[PDB]
């Protein structure tokens, strides 16, 4: 339940079983047990892989405690949803999403020479409608420059490429000046913070647009799934769902000795308890210990 | 919420807003005279200034007890609020039972009466399957895994295309 | 019996967290 690197990730989380294992470990430490030494080993690849597989154990049970704001009109449900995903990323050891995906860009193209190669390497992280708009600008300046546009910063091909990529990004709706002013910085705080307040209006626009796109896809998927399901007769629905339940339950009763399967069956028993305790008192809810 | 909060007996509500419960505070500089009045039973006390500041010393920290999860219950509530939208248009279906009598049987063409009885059987199919609300849970369990795999992103749980394109705008238009 | 707890009920159920933990426990020693 605790492996002494799991419990360091679970300190800053507010999830239920994570705080339960944290409280059990802290309670065992209060009865005179000793803190294990933190391993000063497992070099950068193993460290980043273990970070990836330790933050996911904070992320994914914390995703299931975030209610999707489906069918909710307005700004506040989508802002609540994106704020809860932000706080979940902060609890899991992520940075800001801007800083984290810019770190992904800097890690991917630490080795590139030409700008079409940074477009071939950050292909997976930018939208293809933006990648195509940058590729056509790159071919446009490549026709006139008669050289591969290198990733330099001061070459005339790069300057006349960036002066057009700023134009296409202004066309997309991304204010490139305020984003560059925030991520570059300024001296006087009363003129750096007046553009940080514009970067944060763009940033709030950006993450509510992304969370609303996720909510719209889940709405469309649930409506498509229901309207495929409402066309069946009831006996087909009952036998299909009973077969799916029985197969997924046999998959967990097949593998024994694993921790996930016995947690799966404990959770099935907990759903049966929830049904039983609602059955014994339906106008008050499930029986919570108080 | 935070560890130190700074509210209580200052710019507080002086009266209730609806007539379902009556509440008045006769606040002096030091303490307050509150009489809460709700129907049959009404209560009254003198709440200190050092009590409304001492109330947020411990936190309640409310949390939802769900059958499976809160995400699953949000998806199931959406499925239920869509099945209500389909039920509302199975609610405006015309009563075919007012045309079952034998004066409607023998006046009608045989194939049109067979089509009419098939339409009645079809409505019973649609109404029997739109009110199978014990299927919505296993329908919501089909939206959960793909969404929850999209939130196990290697970048961030909250990352999307707009923030990643804006960060590529910052990254590409900086000095390499 | 009934009336289980409060922290035992706040936990989301069919999240993975133990397939991720199983993949960590079968992967991180195998890559060390």
């Amino acid at each position: 339940a605790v492996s002494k690197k799991e419990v360091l990730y679970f300190l800053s989380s507010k999830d239920a079983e994570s705080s339960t294992a944290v409280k059990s470990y802290l309670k065992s430490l209060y009865a005179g047990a000793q803190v294990e030494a933190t391993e000063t080993d497992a070099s950068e690849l193993i460290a980043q892989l273990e970070k990836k597989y330790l933050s996911a154990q904070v992320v994914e049970p914390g995703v299931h405690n975030i209610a999707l704001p489906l069918g909710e009109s307005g700004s506040a449900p989508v802002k609540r949803y994106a704020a809860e995903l932000f706080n979940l990323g902060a609890q899991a050891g992520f940075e800001c999403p801007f800083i984290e995906v810019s770190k992904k860009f800097g890690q991917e193209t630490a080795t590139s020479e030409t700008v079409k190669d940074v477009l071939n390497k950050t292909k997976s992280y930018v939208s293809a409608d933006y990648n195509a708009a940058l590729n056509e600008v790159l071919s446009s300046v490549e026709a006139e420059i008669n050289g591969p546009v290198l990733f330099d910063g001061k070459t005339e091909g790069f300057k006349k490429f960036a002066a057009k990529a700023k134009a296409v990004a202004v066309s997309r709706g991304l204010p490139a000046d305020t984003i560059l002013a925030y991520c570059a910085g300024s001296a006087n705080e009363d003129a750096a913070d007046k553009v940080s307040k514009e970067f944060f209006t763009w940033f709030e626009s950006a993450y509510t647009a992304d969370a609303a796109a996720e909510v719209k896809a889940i709405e469309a998927e649930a409506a498509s799934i229901l309207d495929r399901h409402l066309a069946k007769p009831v006996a087909q629905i009952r036998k299909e769902q009973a077969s799916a339940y029985a197969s997924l339950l046999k998959r967990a009763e097949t593998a024994k000795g694993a921790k996930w399967a016995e947690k799966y069956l404990e959770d099935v028993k907990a759903v049966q308890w929830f049904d039983a305790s609602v059955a014994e008192a339906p106008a008050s809810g499930p029986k919570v210990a108080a | 919420l935070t560890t130190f909060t700074f509210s209580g007996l200052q710019d507080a509500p002086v009266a209730a807003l609806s007539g379902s419960i009556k509440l008045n505070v006769a606040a002096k500089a030091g303490k307050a005279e509150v009489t809460v009045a709700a129907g049959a039973a009404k209560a009254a006390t003198q709440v200190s200034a050092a009590a409304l500041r001492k109330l947020s010393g411990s936190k309640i920290s409310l949390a939802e007890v769900a059958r499976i999860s809160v995400l699953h219950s949000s998806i199931q509530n959406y499925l239920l609020s869509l099945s209500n939208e389909r039920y509302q248009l199975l609610s405006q279906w015309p009563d075919f039972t007012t045309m079952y009598g034998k004066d409607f049987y023998y006046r009608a063409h045989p194939e049109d009466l067979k089509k009419f009885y098939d339409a009645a059987d079809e409505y019973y199919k649609l109404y029997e399957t739109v009110t199978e609300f014990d299927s919505l849970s296993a329908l919501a369990s089909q939206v959960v895994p793909n969404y929850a795999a999209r939130r196990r992103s290697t970048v961030h749980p909250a990352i999307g295309s707009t923030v990643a394109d804006g960060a590529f705008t910052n990254f590409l238009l900086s000095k390499q | 019996a009934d009336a289980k707890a409060l922290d035992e009920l706040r936990k989301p159920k069919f999240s993975s967290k133990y397939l991720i933990q199983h993949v960590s426990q079968k992967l991180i020693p195998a890559v060390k």
């Binding site: 939208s127 796109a213 996720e214 889940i218 339950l249 | 248009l89 369990s141 795999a149 | 069919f14």
Partner: peptide
Amino acid sequence: YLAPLRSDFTEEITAPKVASASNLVNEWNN
């Protein structure tokens, strides 16, 4: 009510693939 447990990551950043509108409301009005 239970779902298949998956342990895999999303290495790309993609728009979330909105699904097409079904004709079930139009077919039930028909």
